[PDB]
Design an enzyme around this catalytic site. Sequence first.
Site, PDB file in Angstrom:
ATOM      1  N   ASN A   1       0.812  -1.214   0.000  1.00 41.71           N
ATOM      2  CA  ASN A   1       0.000   0.000   0.000  1.00 41.71           C
ATOM      3  C   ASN A   1       0.852   1.274   0.000  1.00 41.71           C
ATOM      4  O   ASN A   1       0.331   2.380   0.082  1.00 41.71           O
ATOM      5  CB  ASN A   1      -1.039  -0.003   1.136  1.00 41.71           C
ATOM      6  CG  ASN A   1      -0.407   0.035   2.505  1.00 41.71           C
ATOM      7  OD1 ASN A   1       0.704   0.524   2.661  1.00 41.71           O
ATOM      8  ND2 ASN A   1      -1.111  -0.478   3.510  1.00 41.71           N
ATOM      9  N   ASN A   2       2.164   1.116  -0.128  1.00 35.94           N
ATOM     10  CA  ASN A   2       3.051   2.274  -0.210  1.00 35.94           C
ATOM     11  C   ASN A   2       2.727   3.138  -1.416  1.00 35.94           C
ATOM     12  O   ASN A   2       2.418   2.613  -2.487  1.00 35.94           O
ATOM     13  CB  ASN A   2       4.510   1.824  -0.315  1.00 35.94           C
ATOM     14  CG  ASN A   2       5.059   1.330   0.999  1.00 35.94           C
ATOM     15  OD1 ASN A   2       4.371   1.355   2.010  1.00 35.94           O
ATOM     16  ND2 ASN A   2       6.307   0.880   0.994  1.00 35.94           N
TER      17      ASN A   2
ATOM     18  N   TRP B   1      -4.200  16.712   6.037  1.00 37.70           N
ATOM     19  CA  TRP B   1      -4.734  17.353   4.833  1.00 37.70           C
ATOM     20  C   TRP B   1      -5.863  16.535   4.210  1.00 37.70           C
ATOM     21  O   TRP B   1      -5.705  15.953   3.139  1.00 37.70           O
ATOM     22  CB  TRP B   1      -3.625  17.566   3.799  1.00 37.70           C
ATOM     23  CG  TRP B   1      -2.517  18.473   4.242  1.00 37.70           C
ATOM     24  CD1 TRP B   1      -2.483  19.254   5.360  1.00 37.70           C
ATOM     25  CD2 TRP B   1      -1.267  18.674   3.570  1.00 37.70           C
ATOM     26  NE1 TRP B   1      -1.286  19.940   5.424  1.00 37.70           N
ATOM     27  CE2 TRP B   1      -0.522  19.598   4.337  1.00 37.70           C
ATOM     28  CE3 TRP B   1      -0.709  18.167   2.393  1.00 37.70           C
ATOM     29  CZ2 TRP B   1       0.755  20.023   3.963  1.00 37.70           C
ATOM     30  CZ3 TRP B   1       0.562  18.589   2.022  1.00 37.70           C
ATOM     31  CH2 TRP B   1       1.277  19.509   2.806  1.00 37.70           C
TER      32      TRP B   1
ATOM     33  N   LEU C   1      -5.590  28.997   8.619  1.00 40.38           N
ATOM     34  CA  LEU C   1      -4.397  28.497   9.283  1.00 40.38           C
ATOM     35  C   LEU C   1      -3.364  28.206   8.190  1.00 40.38           C
ATOM     36  O   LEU C   1      -3.564  27.317   7.359  1.00 40.38           O
ATOM     37  CB  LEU C   1      -4.737  27.224  10.064  1.00 40.38           C
ATOM     38  CG  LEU C   1      -3.705  26.586  10.996  1.00 40.38           C
ATOM     39  CD1 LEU C   1      -3.263  27.570  12.079  1.00 40.38           C
ATOM     40  CD2 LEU C   1      -4.285  25.313  11.623  1.00 40.38           C
TER      41      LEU C   1
ATOM     42  N   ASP D   1      -1.799  28.010   4.870  1.00 40.61           N
ATOM     43  CA  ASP D   1      -2.443  28.064   3.554  1.00 40.61           C
ATOM     44  C   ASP D   1      -3.546  27.025   3.409  1.00 40.61           C
ATOM     45  O   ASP D   1      -3.914  26.640   2.297  1.00 40.61           O
ATOM     46  CB  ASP D   1      -1.403  27.892   2.436  1.00 40.61           C
ATOM     47  CG  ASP D   1      -0.626  26.583   2.545  1.00 40.61           C
ATOM     48  OD1 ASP D   1      -0.821  25.838   3.533  1.00 40.61           O
ATOM     49  OD2 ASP D   1       0.196  26.310   1.637  1.00 40.61           O
TER      50      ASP D   1
ATOM     51  N   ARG E   1      -8.603  12.907  19.497  1.00 41.05           N
ATOM     52  CA  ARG E   1      -7.795  14.100  19.698  1.00 41.05           C
ATOM     53  C   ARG E   1      -8.176  15.102  18.614  1.00 41.05           C
ATOM     54  O   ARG E   1      -7.933  14.867  17.441  1.00 41.05           O
ATOM     55  CB  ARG E   1      -6.300  13.774  19.620  1.00 41.05           C
ATOM     56  CG  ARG E   1      -5.398  14.880  20.153  1.00 41.05           C
ATOM     57  CD  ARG E   1      -5.176  16.000  19.139  1.00 41.05           C
ATOM     58  NE  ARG E   1      -4.293  15.566  18.063  1.00 41.05           N
ATOM     59  CZ  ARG E   1      -3.671  16.385  17.222  1.00 41.05           C
ATOM     60  NH1 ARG E   1      -3.839  17.696  17.327  1.00 41.05           N
ATOM     61  NH2 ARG E   1      -2.884  15.889  16.274  1.00 41.05           N
TER      62      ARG E   1
ATOM     63  N   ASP F   1      -7.767  18.364  16.500  1.00 40.10           N
ATOM     64  CA  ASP F   1      -6.696  19.269  16.127  1.00 40.10           C
ATOM     65  C   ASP F   1      -7.198  20.697  15.941  1.00 40.10           C
ATOM     66  O   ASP F   1      -8.368  20.928  15.652  1.00 40.10           O
ATOM     67  CB  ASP F   1      -6.015  18.788  14.850  1.00 40.10           C
ATOM     68  CG  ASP F   1      -4.770  19.583  14.529  1.00 40.10           C
ATOM     69  OD1 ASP F   1      -3.687  19.226  15.038  1.00 40.10           O
ATOM     70  OD2 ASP F   1      -4.876  20.569  13.777  1.00 40.10           O
TER      71      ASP F   1
ATOM     72  N   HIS G   1      -8.298  27.360  16.843  1.00 39.65           N
ATOM     73  CA  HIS G   1      -8.663  28.025  15.593  1.00 39.65           C
ATOM     74  C   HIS G   1     -10.103  27.807  15.165  1.00 39.65           C
ATOM     75  O   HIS G   1     -10.448  28.059  14.015  1.00 39.65           O
ATOM     76  CB  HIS G   1      -7.715  27.585  14.469  1.00 39.65           C
ATOM     77  CG  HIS G   1      -6.275  27.804  14.800  1.00 39.65           C
ATOM     78  ND1 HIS G   1      -5.710  29.061  14.850  1.00 39.65           N
ATOM     79  CD2 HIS G   1      -5.293  26.937  15.145  1.00 39.65           C
ATOM     80  CE1 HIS G   1      -4.437  28.957  15.188  1.00 39.65           C
ATOM     81  NE2 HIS G   1      -4.159  27.680  15.377  1.00 39.65           N
TER      82      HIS G   1
ATOM     83  N   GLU H   1      -5.704  19.774  20.890  1.00 34.58           N
ATOM     84  CA  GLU H   1      -4.365  20.328  20.895  1.00 34.58           C
ATOM     85  C   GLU H   1      -4.425  21.838  20.757  1.00 34.58           C
ATOM     86  O   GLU H   1      -4.793  22.358  19.701  1.00 34.58           O
ATOM     87  CB  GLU H   1      -3.515  19.743  19.766  1.00 34.58           C
ATOM     88  CG  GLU H   1      -2.102  20.314  19.753  1.00 34.58           C
ATOM     89  CD  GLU H   1      -1.140  19.459  18.961  1.00 34.58           C
ATOM     90  OE1 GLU H   1      -1.604  18.688  18.096  1.00 34.58           O
ATOM     91  OE2 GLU H   1       0.078  19.552  19.210  1.00 34.58           O
TER      92      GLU H   1
ATOM     93  N   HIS I   1       4.740  15.433  18.376  1.00 36.27           N
ATOM     94  CA  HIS I   1       4.994  15.680  16.967  1.00 36.27           C
ATOM     95  C   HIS I   1       5.297  17.147  16.671  1.00 36.27           C
ATOM     96  O   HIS I   1       5.721  17.476  15.562  1.00 36.27           O
ATOM     97  CB  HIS I   1       3.807  15.201  16.125  1.00 36.27           C
ATOM     98  CG  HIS I   1       2.508  15.828  16.516  1.00 36.27           C
ATOM     99  ND1 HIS I   1       1.968  15.691  17.776  1.00 36.27           N
ATOM    100  CD2 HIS I   1       1.642  16.601  15.818  1.00 36.27           C
ATOM    101  CE1 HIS I   1       0.830  16.356  17.841  1.00 36.27           C
ATOM    102  NE2 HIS I   1       0.606  16.913  16.666  1.00 36.27           N
ATOM    103  N   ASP I   2       5.093  18.027  17.651  1.00 39.02           N
ATOM    104  CA  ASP I   2       5.311  19.456  17.412  1.00 39.02           C
ATOM    105  C   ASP I   2       6.263  20.175  18.381  1.00 39.02           C
ATOM    106  O   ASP I   2       6.300  21.404  18.413  1.00 39.02           O
ATOM    107  CB  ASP I   2       3.975  20.214  17.262  1.00 39.02           C
ATOM    108  CG  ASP I   2       3.172  20.259  18.547  1.00 39.02           C
ATOM    109  OD1 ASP I   2       3.482  19.480  19.467  1.00 39.02           O
ATOM    110  OD2 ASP I   2       2.218  21.068  18.633  1.00 39.02           O
TER     111      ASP I   2
ATOM    112  N   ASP J   1      10.316  20.207  13.287  1.00 37.10           N
ATOM    113  CA  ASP J   1       9.500  19.420  12.372  1.00 37.10           C
ATOM    114  C   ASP J   1      10.148  19.542  10.996  1.00 37.10           C
ATOM    115  O   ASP J   1      10.465  20.648  10.566  1.00 37.10           O
ATOM    116  CB  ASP J   1       8.084  20.013  12.344  1.00 37.10           C
ATOM    117  CG  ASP J   1       7.091  19.168  11.556  1.00 37.10           C
ATOM    118  OD1 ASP J   1       7.502  18.431  10.636  1.00 37.10           O
ATOM    119  OD2 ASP J   1       5.879  19.259  11.856  1.00 37.10           O
TER     120      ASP J   1
ATOM    121  N   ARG K   1      10.170  13.516  13.609  1.00 36.05           N
ATOM    122  CA  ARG K   1       9.283  12.474  13.093  1.00 36.05           C
ATOM    123  C   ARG K   1      10.019  11.451  12.229  1.00 36.05           C
ATOM    124  O   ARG K   1       9.517  11.032  11.188  1.00 36.05           O
ATOM    125  CB  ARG K   1       8.135  13.092  12.290  1.00 36.05           C
ATOM    126  CG  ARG K   1       7.268  14.026  13.098  1.00 36.05           C
ATOM    127  CD  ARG K   1       6.256  14.728  12.226  1.00 36.05           C
ATOM    128  NE  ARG K   1       5.612  15.830  12.932  1.00 36.05           N
ATOM    129  CZ  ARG K   1       4.607  16.542  12.436  1.00 36.05           C
ATOM    130  NH1 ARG K   1       4.137  16.261  11.227  1.00 36.05           N
ATOM    131  NH2 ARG K   1       4.075  17.530  13.146  1.00 36.05           N
TER     132      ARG K   1
HETATM  133 CA    CA Z   1       2.907   0.626   3.745  1.00 37.51          CA
HETATM  134 CA    CA Z   2     -11.090  27.915  11.688  1.00 41.54          CA
HETATM  135 CL    CL Z   3      -1.185  25.957  16.122  1.00 41.96          CL
END
Ligand code: CA
Ligand code: CA
Ligand code: CL
Length: 669
Positions: free
Chosen positions: A27-28, A93, A180, A182, A213, A215, A219, A243, A312-313, A356, A360
């Site tokens: 599945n890569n 995304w 937030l 682009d 969680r 995100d 905002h 977060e 992660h941040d 970042d 990661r």
């Molecule tokens: Ca994979």
């Molecule tokens: Ca918003």
């Molecule tokens: Cl933020």
Amino acid sequence: DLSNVNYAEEVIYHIVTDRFKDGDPDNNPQGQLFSNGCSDLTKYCGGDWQGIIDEIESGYLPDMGITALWISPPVENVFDLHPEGFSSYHGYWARDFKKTNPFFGDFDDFSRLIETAHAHDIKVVIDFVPNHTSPVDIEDGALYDNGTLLGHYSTDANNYFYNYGGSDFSDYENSIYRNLYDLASLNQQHSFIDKYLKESIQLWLDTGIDGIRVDAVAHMPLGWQKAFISSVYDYNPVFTFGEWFTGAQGSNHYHHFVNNSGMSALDFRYAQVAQDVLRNQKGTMHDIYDMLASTQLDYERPQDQVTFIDNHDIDRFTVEGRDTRTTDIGLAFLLTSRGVPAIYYGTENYMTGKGDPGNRKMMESFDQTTTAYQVIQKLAPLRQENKAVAYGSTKERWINDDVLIYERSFNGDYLLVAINKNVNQAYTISGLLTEMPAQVYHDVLDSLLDGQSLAVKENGTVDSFLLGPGEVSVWQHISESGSAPVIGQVGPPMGKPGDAVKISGSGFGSEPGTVYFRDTKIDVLTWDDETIVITLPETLGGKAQISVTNSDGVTSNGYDFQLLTGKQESVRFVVDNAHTNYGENVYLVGNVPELGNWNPADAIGPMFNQVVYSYPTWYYDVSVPADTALEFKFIIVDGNGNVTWESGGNHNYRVTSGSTDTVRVSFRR
Ligand SMILES: [Ca+2]
Ligand SMILES: [Ca+2]
Ligand SMILES: [Cl-]
Ligand SMILES: [Ca+2]
Ligand SMILES: [Ca+2]
Ligand SMILES: [Ca+2]
Ligand SMILES: [Ca+2]
Ligand SMILES: [Cl-]
Ligand SMILES: [Cl-]
Ligand SMILES: [Cl-]
Ligand SMILES: [Cl-]
Ligand SMILES: [Cl-]
Ligand SMILES: [Cl-]
Ligand SMILES: [Cl-]
Ligand SMILES: [Cl-]
Ligand SMILES: [Cl-]
Ligand SMILES: [Cl-]
Ligand SMILES: [Cl-]
Ligand SMILES: [Cl-]
Ligand code: NA
């Protein structure tokens, strides 16, 4: 059913899916989206759900003692690269909230992950990103609904997206309604999109996830989020946290979110001070305890916050080229502190990396023999067996620049932890006092971190001992079903009348006593010494205390709870012609507790007046009960808290439910 509402006894292991294990090379991605050997950390490296399954089956994960897996968003993401080379490997995304990211797996793979984790009593928490779809320059923010195109950002004809200017270095209002970075901002207030996001989270709840969680909670309007999470609790309650990036001292808006949103947060105050003092040698143990005392006061529910020492941040906790004992110490601190600990994948194998995506990297190896892995093995279980660790307050028993000795306690259970962060110096500890019962205690770490025994005397004193360089000792006392009821956690922390809620603690007794909200008796469904399930009473809501009285007539501590008036909808309140003098702001107040129950001290605001509408029009998105007679007024409040009321009678409205709404009036002067 209510099995997922209380995470106080859990230890979370946080995985970036793409970077953990490639269990299914087939599945890569192929071509530019994929980085062979993970040499380009902005691309997909191949980590997937089968890989997580593999590491459950091998024993690596369950043997570590962790009890929950927190993973990247599972939803379908854009398949094209950002013009600058960045890929959607991270899952943030989205293009279709109703489908899987096929690089992580299909729905069958996801089901196998859920089934495998559950088979080992491991919960699964997913990231969920209701704020946005994708960077606008990739596919114009394309949003699909189980394969059906809903629309695009720049050409939006249905107000599915927010299209405002900016923003750079934003204020709160701009931080919410402008993009937030682009990223194509979803218009959550649009009825169709609100419904879509609800259908989407419900689909994932149906797959068997155990937590969420959220995100980008900094905002989105708190009012929209409150209505949304209330609908999650209505449908299938699971532990939910957001977060909100902040610093050591947090912020006004952050604290309002923590205490008023209906969900908890990642404890950035804890994490930032742990990094300052332990990782980066800034300040002293005095700074750590200041943070513990301050957050114990500022958070209504410390036990609900998700703690961490990296993620992660922020920078990886393990500094390159330094004695890794420091990471071991950081983990020991994390695992024994208040709040739900989240270990970032690879901490246990001393992975390094600043910024970042340097933080990661692909999981290096799966080494069960590290000191860190063993530290987790010894301490993770404490949260399930010792109520002081899960629910207890925190007290300082001994401190200097390098040493902190802290005590947790809950209804007769105790924890005492001694940490010396200085790997080069030992300290003689004299005058130590503890509330633990007299006896000899043995180090729960079995001297893994050079720990030792503790002899506690009848009067609470302890003989002098030497705390070695980099030493951590952990001591505990567990008592039988306590006397006197004590509430440790209530989940969900918010609900409407009729909703089932779980009260967790100890000393409740075996037979039904009574439960109260404020001074109203509540219906009990089930009752035992550590768990009571109730259904919320029909009475004036707001934030008040739940208290438990055992069958012996002994009453517990009061525990903050937020009772809603009914089913919530996000309603945008708009008021025109509201002129103010400098220093004043408009607030909204009204009959139901969602609107402050007529108390200016509890009014909603300060309202906004720049982006969606312009002064002297003000607006705010507010969670209010549907199918309920609302009466409200606007007030003008100055810097001293002086209140001036709209003249005339109340504005009346009834939200004819099943959807978001907007209500608009002119200010009566
Ligand atoms: Ca994979
Ligand atoms: Ca918003
Ligand atoms: Cl933020
Ligand atoms: Ca399998
Ligand atoms: Ca398209
Ligand atoms: Ca529409
Ligand atoms: Ca000394
Ligand atoms: Cl249950
Ligand atoms: Cl390549
Ligand atoms: Cl300093
Ligand atoms: Cl030194
Ligand atoms: Cl005391
Ligand atoms: Cl609810
Ligand atoms: Cl009893
Ligand atoms: Cl019982
Ligand atoms: Cl102001
Ligand atoms: Cl008044
Ligand atoms: Cl009514
Ligand atoms: Cl209008
Ligand atoms: Na609200």
